[PDB]
Amino acid sequence: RSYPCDEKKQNDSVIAECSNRRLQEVPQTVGKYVTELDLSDNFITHITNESFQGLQNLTKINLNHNPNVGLNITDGAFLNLKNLRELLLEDNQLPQIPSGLPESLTELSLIQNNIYNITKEGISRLINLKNLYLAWNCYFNKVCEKTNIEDGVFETLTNLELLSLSFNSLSHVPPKLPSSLRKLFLSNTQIKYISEEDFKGLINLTLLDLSGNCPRCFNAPFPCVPCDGGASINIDRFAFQNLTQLRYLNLSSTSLRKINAAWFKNMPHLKVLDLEFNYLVGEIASGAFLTMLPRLEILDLSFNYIKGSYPQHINISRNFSKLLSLRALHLRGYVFQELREDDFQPLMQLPNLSTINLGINFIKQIDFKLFQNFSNLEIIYLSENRISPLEFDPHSNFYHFTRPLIKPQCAAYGKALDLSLNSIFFIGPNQFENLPDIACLNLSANSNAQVLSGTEFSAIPHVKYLDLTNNRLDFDNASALTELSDLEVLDLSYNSHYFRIAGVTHHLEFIQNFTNLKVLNLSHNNIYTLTDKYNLESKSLVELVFSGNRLDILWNDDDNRYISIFKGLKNLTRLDLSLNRLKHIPNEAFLNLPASLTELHINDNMLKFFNWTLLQQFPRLELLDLRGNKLLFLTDSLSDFTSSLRTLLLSHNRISHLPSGFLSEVSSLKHLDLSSNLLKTINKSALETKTTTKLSMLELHGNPFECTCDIGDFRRWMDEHLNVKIPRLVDVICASPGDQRGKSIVSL
Amino acid sequence: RSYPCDEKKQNDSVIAECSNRRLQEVPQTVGKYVTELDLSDNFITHITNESFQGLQNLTKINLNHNPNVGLNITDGAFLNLKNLRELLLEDNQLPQIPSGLPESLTELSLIQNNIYNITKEGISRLINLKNLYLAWNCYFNKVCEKTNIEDGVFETLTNLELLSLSFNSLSHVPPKLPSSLRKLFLSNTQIKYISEEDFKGLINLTLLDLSGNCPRCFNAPFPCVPCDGGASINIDRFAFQNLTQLRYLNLSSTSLRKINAAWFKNMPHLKVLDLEFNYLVGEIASGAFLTMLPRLEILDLSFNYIKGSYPQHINISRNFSKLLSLRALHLRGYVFQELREDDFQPLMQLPNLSTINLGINFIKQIDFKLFQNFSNLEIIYLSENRISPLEFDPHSNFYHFTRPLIKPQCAAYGKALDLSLNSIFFIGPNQFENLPDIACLNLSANSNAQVLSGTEFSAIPHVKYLDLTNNRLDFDNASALTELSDLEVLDLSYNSHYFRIAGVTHHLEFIQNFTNLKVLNLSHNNIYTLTDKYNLESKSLVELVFSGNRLDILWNDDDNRYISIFKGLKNLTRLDLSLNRLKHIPNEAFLNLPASLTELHINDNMLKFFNWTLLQQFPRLELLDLRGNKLLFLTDSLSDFTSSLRTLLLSHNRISHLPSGFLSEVSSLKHLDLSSNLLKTINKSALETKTTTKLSMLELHGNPFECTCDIGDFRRWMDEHLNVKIPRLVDVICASPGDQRGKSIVSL
Ligand SMILES: *[C@@H]1O[C@H](CO)[C@@H](O[C@@H]2O[C@H](CO)[C@@H](O[C@@H]3O[C@H](CO)[C@@H](O)[C@H](O)[C@@H]3O)[C@H](O)[C@H]2NC(C)=O)[C@H](O)[C@H]1NC(C)=O
Ligand SMILES: *[C@@H]1O[C@H](CO)[C@@H](O[C@@H]2O[C@H](CO)[C@@H](O[C@@H]3O[C@H](CO)[C@@H](O)[C@H](O)[C@@H]3O)[C@H](O)[C@H]2NC(C)=O)[C@H](O)[C@H]1NC(C)=O
Ligand SMILES: *[C@@H]1O[C@H](CO)[C@@H](O[C@@H]2O[C@H](CO)[C@@H](O)[C@H](O)[C@H]2NC(C)=O)[C@H](O)[C@H]1NC(C)=O
Ligand SMILES: *[C@@H]1O[C@H](CO)[C@@H](O[C@@H]2O[C@H](CO)[C@@H](O)[C@H](O)[C@H]2NC(C)=O)[C@H](O)[C@H]1NC(C)=O
Ligand SMILES: O=c1ccn([C@@H]2O[C@H](CO)[C@@H](O)[C@H]2O)c(=O)[nH]1
Ligand SMILES: O=c1ccn([C@@H]2O[C@H](CO)[C@@H](O)[C@H]2O)c(=O)[nH]1
Ligand SMILES: *[C@@H]1O[C@H](CO)[C@@H](O)[C@H](O)[C@H]1NC(C)=O
Ligand SMILES: *[C@@H]1O[C@H](CO)[C@@H](O)[C@H](O)[C@H]1NC(C)=O
Ligand SMILES: *[C@@H]1O[C@H](CO)[C@@H](O)[C@H](O)[C@H]1NC(C)=O
Ligand SMILES: *[C@@H]1O[C@H](CO)[C@@H](O)[C@H](O)[C@H]1NC(C)=O
Ligand SMILES: *[C@@H]1O[C@H](CO)[C@@H](O)[C@H](O)[C@H]1NC(C)=O
Ligand SMILES: *[C@@H]1O[C@H](CO)[C@@H](O)[C@H](O)[C@H]1NC(C)=O
Ligand SMILES: *[C@@H]1O[C@H](CO)[C@@H](O)[C@H](O)[C@H]1NC(C)=O
Ligand SMILES: *[C@@H]1O[C@H](CO)[C@@H](O)[C@H](O)[C@H]1NC(C)=O
Ligand SMILES: *[C@@H]1O[C@H](CO)[C@@H](O)[C@H](O)[C@H]1NC(C)=O
Ligand SMILES: *[C@@H]1O[C@H](CO)[C@@H](O)[C@H](O)[C@H]1NC(C)=O
Ligand SMILES: *[C@@H]1O[C@H](CO)[C@@H](O)[C@H](O)[C@H]1NC(C)=O
Ligand SMILES: *[C@@H]1O[C@H](CO)[C@@H](O)[C@H](O)[C@H]1NC(C)=O
Ligand SMILES: *[C@@H]1O[C@H](CO)[C@@H](O)[C@H](O)[C@H]1NC(C)=O
Ligand SMILES: *[C@@H]1O[C@H](CO)[C@@H](O)[C@H](O)[C@H]1NC(C)=O
């Protein structure tokens, strides 16, 4: 669109995406209309006053991860960009803060460099700075120096709201912090003592992160240095006195054995309290601090286990009943054998508690009926226990994953129960009695070997999304699951166990019984043989995932029984036939795929040939995905066979000719993917649709191009249609002639 | 060696391997010294009198699978090959038996063609034939005709010993069979009735296969047509009267409900009796026929279950106690809930019974102590049941797999117990009491989540090979397995369950405790973090499989703890580091790999660079395997860094230059693999070792070669060293110049 950069005029403003394009310099061709410039992930080793001459409306520049193999920045290189507000210089191996940065700046990131010198000369004049990131310059077993913070360097930054200094060796909270601060990150900074003076004047603070100071190092997944004797962090009883607005407090991995309730005396708006990786089993049981937390919404007490201990029960203070605003409680990694109804009484009147997380506790037994007696649990998270039948992203949390506990597609339906990664290897007749009205149920990876027979889920009959992936279900009864009459989504992925055995029964008849089944995933089941009924049928099903089965055997030329296997899926729009070892598809089998299809995937098979003519029988087909096969040839008469195709994905095949004509009157085609094929060239005509083109994406990288003078018309075409995104254009590489043998088009 | 063919002068005789070389004709360059010629798997569409002009010492020709896309053979094409004994013409889409075949023939195979016409004109003069294969010409839902066998066609073949007509539509045993027959195959031939006359004169017969006539079709994994009403095959009571020498009788899938004991009256040397896929639950219980089988060594009664039945116990006739020669009993697929000691009393005095196979019965409970009371069980096969804590190869068996029940590497150690693919999800304290002295134990795929602690295998303390693959073991105790003091082979593959979780313990210390541990497989465990001890140690271990773990994280530049992870494996010769997502290996980590290594695999990683200089620290290194990485460059000074390397595998990398010099003084190098790289050319010098070369294999296929006149010296070199196998030479393909763009070298 603006080589070597794209642009988006989106919408008030103008972004030049010049990312990951192995540039060796800032390109001088950037349009002076651009406001934001992304130069990240290139090979840039120098920035000078020449670099942005040039581009006086620039308000943001992202130089992260250059050269991605440090970056050498001249004094005052940016100094004449009057409008520059945001400057990202992460992971550039910088040995110092660049000198002569512009006073315009409001955001500066210097995360993941080699800076151990924070000087007034560097930053004290940047008086418009709001956010300053200096995290991850010295940590673990990196070779590096303690951070030298010149006294009062930050004091003149009277607009500073965010300061991040985590993952650096500091030893003390810096003094003379501006009272504008709202968020102060000091994790893993080797700070053993927090004095009364350290945060005294910071009355605007809403976040304080002191995690990983005096860390808990047992079983640490990184190089970990504890305080002497694995001692607790030492926090003066008044250290938080003035922090009246505090909303987030992270004390994870500070080796706490005791929580000074007084810490929260003046902090009545605290909403999120993170106490993972301490030694708090005692405090969880007794727990004065728990009376001081009236507005607390999220409490994380995960991984406080005593090593080698495996108590029968979890011991929860009555004082949990004081957590009236609590929405989510995380108690992973306490480690205990049995959860009884009594043990959680202090939680049962908390009006807003919607999520309980007891993952990873090695729990053997649960009194399931206790959950009903909560006021309004929405998410009951029991994944990764022992229940049986009745390297680091600097912009992420370091102590826990932040992905939803339950997939949003499943939780959307209603109350959720996650029993994955346990040992519920069959479901007895009372397994789900006394539960709430579960809508979303996860029994993935229970090595369940049951003959489901239409009774097993009768006590939670309203499940709508059921995840049964990674079990070993035995399909010997045609009434399986049929008691779930409102079932919409059924994941049977990775249940190959019994499908792989010819000699036992495989009954999938049950599929047809559901009036509202929409999405079925039969992936990675190794299905090659069925009992009695060879046809799948449903008046409702939208999407069928059949990848990683054996259609190569089901559609074997000497066997006619499966030739209409999917035809009875009369509503189907989406079908995934990937990874079925197919070398060809019998024409009759293809013509019996449902005519309702809008999306068909046959990627990662071994197809030599595709019968294009048969697309005439699929007038609703919008996406066809044939990536990763062995195809040599495309039809020259595509518009004779489809008027509907919008996306055609043909990467990783053996296509050496692209017929002039291919284009013709195709019109619906938005997205054509020809990357990773055997293409020496591309003719003009092969694109120039004499109707209207919807062409907006055309992929070509990984073809052995030839950059003889003509050209082709291709380059001319490219400019004739600057609005056709062609990603990875730098990866479209002349393999010839030899004056180009590793060059990107174009350059003459 | 003899383009386009190899040759082996091995040893009295001379084999020309011209297989799978996409030939379009029989090459006229075959040396008249050749005795056996393999032309299988090519694109040959014609055979004429010209084809073997030429080659008068030919005794064997294999033309199977031509053209592999039928084959058109002229009358008498082979007629002048006086010494021709064996002719394989399988899978050639032949519409008839070729005419004018030579009388010299002793073996003729015509399996998998379109022959429905067996005529005197075709074969009656082939009076030297011993073995005649005509199987698989008409079967399943192939479009084909009933087989017309001209009356008395076989009668003149008075040397015929083997006749195979299986998988053809016959309806009746052919009459006028020669009394020379020893083996008669008639499986799946649509023969409903066996009369007294059918085998009357066949006194030399030792094998008769009548399987799949009136088949059991429930749950059939192929198109199956039963006799009317699913009726039994009808075998006249005297049909086997004269078959006194019979050794093998296959009656699998003949819908038998009743076994006429009289069938075996005159057949006292029967050794193998196959009765799979019938309806014999009644006969197994009552069983007169069982008294008639004194020399029987293998009995197969698998898959006789009654559909939908799930009896509590298996019912075995007392008459099994008459099977005095029995060595192996196969009772898969009976389907029953519990095996009690009583139920197998009739087996317990059989002196030679070494294998009991009860796979695939969905058994829930076993009285394990019953096995001890057998005389000398060697293999106790219980795989694929429900036990819980206390398309078709025409040359293979069609009704069961013929691979060993136990891997020979494990069974070699002694008595074997296979409990794989059950639900023994923990091992209680008495689980293995009252067993024989087990040496080989398979607990693979029991979803076992146990903390092994050094007591669990105490009642079978002599296990030497333990297969624990595909479980979810929790390594929380450093004494795991240590009670097995003689343990030699330990397979922990596919136990990623708990390794993937950072926050729980992973203790592999136990490895060091074993005095005789030789082979350890830790593949596909996703190992990225260990507890307390970061080093693996053993004075004995020979082989460590560490593929599919996360060495990319273990050897992260900011973490020093795993930099000597394998160093303490002081005896190690073989190490597999494949599939660990490695982009580079820190030099220190490489130099700390044990100096004892003779074989190192680092294939299927993402390496851009390899430090060749560090091979100086591995003076015993014989094999180095770097396939499937991103390497661009080879060292020009290999002999400076190793004098030991014998095999170097470098396929699927990005190597475009092969330094002249690479060769130099390398001498130990037998096998060089450069296939699937980016090589435009290969210089002469790059090979011509001025010391002695051990070069015997050099792979090059899948490189973009250039076939400009010079040449190189390469082609000259090739002939200068005709004894260097270069497999897939036809796949070494000129990508240039354009007069060659898809040609194989060489051709000018
Ligand atoms: C078995 O198949 C189902 C159906 O394909 C899989 O769930 C589906 O996963 C896709 C791929 O992630 C989800 O699509 C994504 O949704 C997000 C959020 O809306 C969107 O941002 C992405 O661009 C993408 O569209 C799809 O919603 C989801 N469907 C359902 C019903 O949950 C499932 O993951 C497969 N199971 C396994 C074990 O592979
Ligand atoms: C875990 O690793 C072990 C050790 O590599 C695997 O067993 C080993 O498998 C190899 C590959 O098949 C066996 O080598 C083969 O032996 C046969 C018969 O002697 C030979 O003909 C072949 O050319 C080849 O050498 C090797 O014997 C065997 N080792 C042992 C101790 O059994 C094992 O399969 C791996 N487990 C999984 C689940 O992948
Ligand atoms: C059911 O639980 C399983 C296991 O906890 C979930 O599987 C994980 O899904 C996440 C998010 O997609 C993946 O990144 C993980 O790799 C999966 N983990 C494993 C162990 O397979 C699954 O998503 C849960 N189902 C629902 C509906 O929430
Ligand atoms: C333990 O049992 C497992 C399962 O029966 C065996 O695994 C099979 O091994 C065969 C022969 O290598 C493979 O072709 C199969 O794919 C494997 N099956 C499965 C389900 O994984 C294993 O070989 C047995 N171990 C020993 C020592 O005999
Ligand atoms: O089955 C169990 C039970 C308890 N623990 C404990 O859980 C903690 C984390 O692994 C350790 O202290 C360990 O003793 C386990 O690891 N596995
Ligand atoms: O768990 C069980 C028990 C029995 N069967 C029976 O085994 C035979 C083969 O699948 C069928 O008759 C079926 O009823 C099973 O499939 N699963
Ligand atoms: C950059 O600075 C040099 C002097 O060091 C000057 O000669 C040159 O014109 C400057 N370039 C721009 C674009 O200002
Ligand atoms: C940085 O670059 C300048 C010129 O662009 C050069 O003179 C200087 O040596 C470089 N500094 C470092 C520390 O590499
Ligand atoms: C710190 O930076 C200052 C100010 O730019 C510089 O003068 C000094 O040399 C630096 N000191 C160290 C130790 O890097
Ligand atoms: C607190 O914050 C605001 C800006 O959000 C600032 O203007 C005000 O002066 C601050 N007060 C103190 C005491 O720092
Ligand atoms: C399925 O199981 C139910 C419950 O045991 C049983 O009653 C029914 O007969 C079974 N078979 C079929 C085909 O539905
Ligand atoms: C058919 O599929 C569509 C999506 O294409 C879905 O909206 C509708 O609910 C399904 N129809 C039926 C009858 O279930
Ligand atoms: C495509 O299939 C049609 C109908 O099955 C058939 O007539 C035609 O020959 C096939 N085309 C190719 C190119 O094989
Ligand atoms: C093959 O037969 C033809 C006659 O059909 C004859 O002219 C020719 O010489 C023969 N070739 C050989 C090698 O015998
Ligand atoms: C077989 O080949 C001969 C000549 O080589 C040709 O004349 C004849 O038509 C072919 N026969 C068939 C059935 O294709
Ligand atoms: C069978 O082969 C004979 C002898 O070669 C031939 O004459 C006849 O045409 C063939 N009959 C059929 C039905 O193919
Ligand atoms: C049986 O077999 C031998 C060859 O093995 C043959 O010579 C002998 O004549 C045969 N006897 C009969 C009765 O066919
Ligand atoms: C391992 O388990 C055994 C048996 O319970 C126990 O006695 C021992 O103390 C455990 N721990 C270690 C480190 O061996
Ligand atoms: C060391 O390895 C070899 C194979 O290299 C093996 O023969 C020997 O038993 C092992 N040594 C010890 C001490 O276990
Ligand atoms: C190979 O490693 C050695 C020793 O660690 C080091 O001196 C040398 O620079 C490395 N070689 C390359 C080519 O990086």
PDB file of N, CA and C in Angstrom, chain B residues 279-319:
ATOM      1  N   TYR B 279     -20.225 -67.943  15.929  1.00  0.00           N
ATOM      2  CA  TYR B 279     -21.195 -67.796  16.972  1.00  0.00           C
ATOM      3  C   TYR B 279     -21.076 -68.910  17.970  1.00  0.00           C
ATOM      4  N   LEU B 280     -19.883 -69.072  18.530  1.00  0.00           N
ATOM      5  CA  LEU B 280     -19.508 -70.307  19.213  1.00  0.00           C
ATOM      6  C   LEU B 280     -19.527 -70.261  20.745  1.00  0.00           C
ATOM      7  N   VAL B 281     -20.164 -69.264  21.345  1.00  0.00           N
ATOM      8  CA  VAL B 281     -20.212 -69.250  22.804  1.00  0.00           C
ATOM      9  C   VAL B 281     -20.703 -70.574  23.402  1.00  0.00           C
ATOM     10  N   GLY B 282     -21.777 -71.137  22.823  1.00  0.00           N
ATOM     11  CA  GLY B 282     -22.278 -72.477  23.183  1.00  0.00           C
ATOM     12  C   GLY B 282     -21.212 -73.552  23.081  1.00  0.00           C
ATOM     13  N   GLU B 283     -20.534 -73.612  21.940  1.00  0.00           N
ATOM     14  CA  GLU B 283     -19.525 -74.647  21.736  1.00  0.00           C
ATOM     15  C   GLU B 283     -18.309 -74.480  22.628  1.00  0.00           C
ATOM     16  N   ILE B 284     -17.941 -73.239  22.958  1.00  0.00           N
ATOM     17  CA  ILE B 284     -16.863 -73.043  23.920  1.00  0.00           C
ATOM     18  C   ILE B 284     -17.212 -73.630  25.280  1.00  0.00           C
ATOM     19  N   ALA B 285     -18.475 -73.538  25.651  1.00  0.00           N
ATOM     20  CA  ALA B 285     -18.922 -74.057  26.959  1.00  0.00           C
ATOM     21  C   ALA B 285     -19.044 -75.616  27.000  1.00  0.00           C
ATOM     22  N   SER B 286     -19.512 -76.197  25.910  1.00  0.00           N
ATOM     23  CA  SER B 286     -19.886 -77.616  25.918  1.00  0.00           C
ATOM     24  C   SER B 286     -18.797 -78.432  25.227  1.00  0.00           C
ATOM     25  N   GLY B 287     -18.634 -78.191  23.926  1.00  0.00           N
ATOM     26  CA  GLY B 287     -17.383 -78.435  23.227  1.00  0.00           C
ATOM     27  C   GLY B 287     -16.888 -79.857  22.986  1.00  0.00           C
ATOM     28  N   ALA B 288     -17.656 -80.672  22.251  1.00  0.00           N
ATOM     29  CA  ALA B 288     -17.203 -82.049  21.917  1.00  0.00           C
ATOM     30  C   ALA B 288     -15.917 -81.978  21.081  1.00  0.00           C
ATOM     31  N   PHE B 289     -15.956 -81.144  20.054  1.00  0.00           N
ATOM     32  CA  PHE B 289     -14.818 -80.998  19.124  1.00  0.00           C
ATOM     33  C   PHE B 289     -13.486 -80.840  19.850  1.00  0.00           C
ATOM     34  N   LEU B 290     -13.509 -80.297  21.070  1.00  0.00           N
ATOM     35  CA  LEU B 290     -12.290 -80.066  21.834  1.00  0.00           C
ATOM     36  C   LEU B 290     -11.561 -81.346  22.260  1.00  0.00           C
ATOM     37  N   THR B 291     -12.267 -82.490  22.225  1.00  0.00           N
ATOM     38  CA  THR B 291     -11.652 -83.778  22.578  1.00  0.00           C
ATOM     39  C   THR B 291     -10.881 -84.391  21.401  1.00  0.00           C
ATOM     40  N   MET B 292     -11.014 -83.815  20.226  1.00  0.00           N
ATOM     41  CA  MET B 292     -10.478 -84.381  19.014  1.00  0.00           C
ATOM     42  C   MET B 292      -9.156 -83.732  18.539  1.00  0.00           C
ATOM     43  N   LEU B 293      -8.468 -82.997  19.415  1.00  0.00           N
ATOM     44  CA  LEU B 293      -7.433 -82.035  18.977  1.00  0.00           C
ATOM     45  C   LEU B 293      -6.163 -82.198  19.767  1.00  0.00           C
ATOM     46  N   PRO B 294      -5.599 -83.413  19.771  1.00  0.00           N
ATOM     47  CA  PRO B 294      -4.489 -83.763  20.630  1.00  0.00           C
ATOM     48  C   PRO B 294      -3.189 -83.065  20.296  1.00  0.00           C
ATOM     49  N   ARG B 295      -2.983 -82.634  19.049  1.00  0.00           N
ATOM     50  CA  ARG B 295      -1.719 -82.032  18.676  1.00  0.00           C
ATOM     51  C   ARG B 295      -1.846 -80.510  18.435  1.00  0.00           C
ATOM     52  N   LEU B 296      -3.015 -79.964  18.739  1.00  0.00           N
ATOM     53  CA  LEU B 296      -3.310 -78.579  18.487  1.00  0.00           C
ATOM     54  C   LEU B 296      -2.455 -77.651  19.351  1.00  0.00           C
ATOM     55  N   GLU B 297      -1.788 -76.708  18.693  1.00  0.00           N
ATOM     56  CA  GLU B 297      -0.913 -75.787  19.378  1.00  0.00           C
ATOM     57  C   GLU B 297      -1.454 -74.365  19.536  1.00  0.00           C
ATOM     58  N   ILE B 298      -2.234 -73.916  18.563  1.00  0.00           N
ATOM     59  CA  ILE B 298      -2.829 -72.568  18.568  1.00  0.00           C
ATOM     60  C   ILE B 298      -4.322 -72.709  18.275  1.00  0.00           C
ATOM     61  N   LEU B 299      -5.128 -72.189  19.182  1.00  0.00           N
ATOM     62  CA  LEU B 299      -6.558 -72.154  18.995  1.00  0.00           C
ATOM     63  C   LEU B 299      -7.003 -70.694  19.082  1.00  0.00           C
ATOM     64  N   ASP B 300      -7.699 -70.219  18.056  1.00  0.00           N
ATOM     65  CA  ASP B 300      -8.245 -68.846  18.009  1.00  0.00           C
ATOM     66  C   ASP B 300      -9.747 -68.825  17.955  1.00  0.00           C
ATOM     67  N   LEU B 301     -10.318 -68.439  19.085  1.00  0.00           N
ATOM     68  CA  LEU B 301     -11.755 -68.344  19.243  1.00  0.00           C
ATOM     69  C   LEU B 301     -12.207 -66.876  19.445  1.00  0.00           C
ATOM     70  N   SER B 302     -11.441 -65.922  18.926  1.00  0.00           N
ATOM     71  CA  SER B 302     -11.721 -64.513  19.209  1.00  0.00           C
ATOM     72  C   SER B 302     -13.010 -64.037  18.496  1.00  0.00           C
ATOM     73  N   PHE B 303     -13.631 -63.011  19.057  1.00  0.00           N
ATOM     74  CA  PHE B 303     -14.798 -62.374  18.423  1.00  0.00           C
ATOM     75  C   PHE B 303     -15.951 -63.339  18.112  1.00  0.00           C
ATOM     76  N   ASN B 304     -16.336 -64.092  19.134  1.00  0.00           N
ATOM     77  CA  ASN B 304     -17.501 -64.944  19.058  1.00  0.00           C
ATOM     78  C   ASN B 304     -18.632 -64.394  19.921  1.00  0.00           C
ATOM     79  N   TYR B 305     -18.475 -63.173  20.386  1.00  0.00           N
ATOM     80  CA  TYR B 305     -19.460 -62.581  21.276  1.00  0.00           C
ATOM     81  C   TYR B 305     -20.870 -62.601  20.694  1.00  0.00           C
ATOM     82  N   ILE B 306     -21.843 -62.665  21.591  1.00  0.00           N
ATOM     83  CA  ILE B 306     -23.248 -62.438  21.239  1.00  0.00           C
ATOM     84  C   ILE B 306     -23.540 -60.945  21.384  1.00  0.00           C
ATOM     85  N   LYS B 307     -23.927 -60.299  20.304  1.00  0.00           N
ATOM     86  CA  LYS B 307     -24.113 -58.877  20.328  1.00  0.00           C
ATOM     87  C   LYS B 307     -25.089 -58.477  21.439  1.00  0.00           C
ATOM     88  N   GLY B 308     -24.724 -57.420  22.174  1.00  0.00           N
ATOM     89  CA  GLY B 308     -25.515 -56.895  23.275  1.00  0.00           C
ATOM     90  C   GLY B 308     -25.466 -57.728  24.532  1.00  0.00           C
ATOM     91  N   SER B 309     -24.714 -58.817  24.551  1.00  0.00           N
ATOM     92  CA  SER B 309     -24.644 -59.658  25.759  1.00  0.00           C
ATOM     93  C   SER B 309     -23.423 -59.245  26.558  1.00  0.00           C
ATOM     94  N   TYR B 310     -23.496 -59.342  27.875  1.00  0.00           N
ATOM     95  CA  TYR B 310     -22.377 -58.982  28.707  1.00  0.00           C
ATOM     96  C   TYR B 310     -22.440 -59.879  29.937  1.00  0.00           C
ATOM     97  N   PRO B 311     -22.186 -61.176  29.735  1.00  0.00           N
ATOM     98  CA  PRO B 311     -22.292 -62.130  30.832  1.00  0.00           C
ATOM     99  C   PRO B 311     -21.305 -61.852  31.924  1.00  0.00           C
ATOM    100  N   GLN B 312     -21.658 -62.269  33.131  1.00  0.00           N
ATOM    101  CA  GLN B 312     -20.753 -62.115  34.259  1.00  0.00           C
ATOM    102  C   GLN B 312     -19.443 -62.888  34.085  1.00  0.00           C
ATOM    103  N   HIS B 313     -19.539 -64.133  33.600  1.00  0.00           N
ATOM    104  CA  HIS B 313     -18.400 -65.047  33.517  1.00  0.00           C
ATOM    105  C   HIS B 313     -18.261 -65.686  32.154  1.00  0.00           C
ATOM    106  N   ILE B 314     -17.046 -66.139  31.865  1.00  0.00           N
ATOM    107  CA  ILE B 314     -16.757 -66.859  30.641  1.00  0.00           C
ATOM    108  C   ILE B 314     -16.961 -68.316  30.960  1.00  0.00           C
ATOM    109  N   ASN B 315     -17.582 -69.023  30.031  1.00  0.00           N
ATOM    110  CA  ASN B 315     -17.882 -70.430  30.249  1.00  0.00           C
ATOM    111  C   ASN B 315     -17.101 -71.375  29.331  1.00  0.00           C
ATOM    112  N   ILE B 316     -16.107 -72.027  29.933  1.00  0.00           N
ATOM    113  CA  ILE B 316     -15.066 -72.825  29.275  1.00  0.00           C
ATOM    114  C   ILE B 316     -15.366 -74.314  29.546  1.00  0.00           C
ATOM    115  N   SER B 317     -15.559 -75.117  28.497  1.00  0.00           N
ATOM    116  CA  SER B 317     -15.760 -76.568  28.685  1.00  0.00           C
ATOM    117  C   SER B 317     -14.599 -77.252  29.386  1.00  0.00           C
ATOM    118  N   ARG B 318     -14.901 -78.194  30.274  1.00  0.00           N
ATOM    119  CA  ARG B 318     -13.903 -79.093  30.810  1.00  0.00           C
ATOM    120  C   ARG B 318     -13.019 -79.701  29.728  1.00  0.00           C
ATOM    121  N   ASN B 319     -13.592 -79.912  28.571  1.00  0.00           N
ATOM    122  CA  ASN B 319     -12.873 -80.526  27.459  1.00  0.00           C
ATOM    123  C   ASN B 319     -11.658 -79.732  26.938  1.00  0.00           C
TER     124      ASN B 319
END
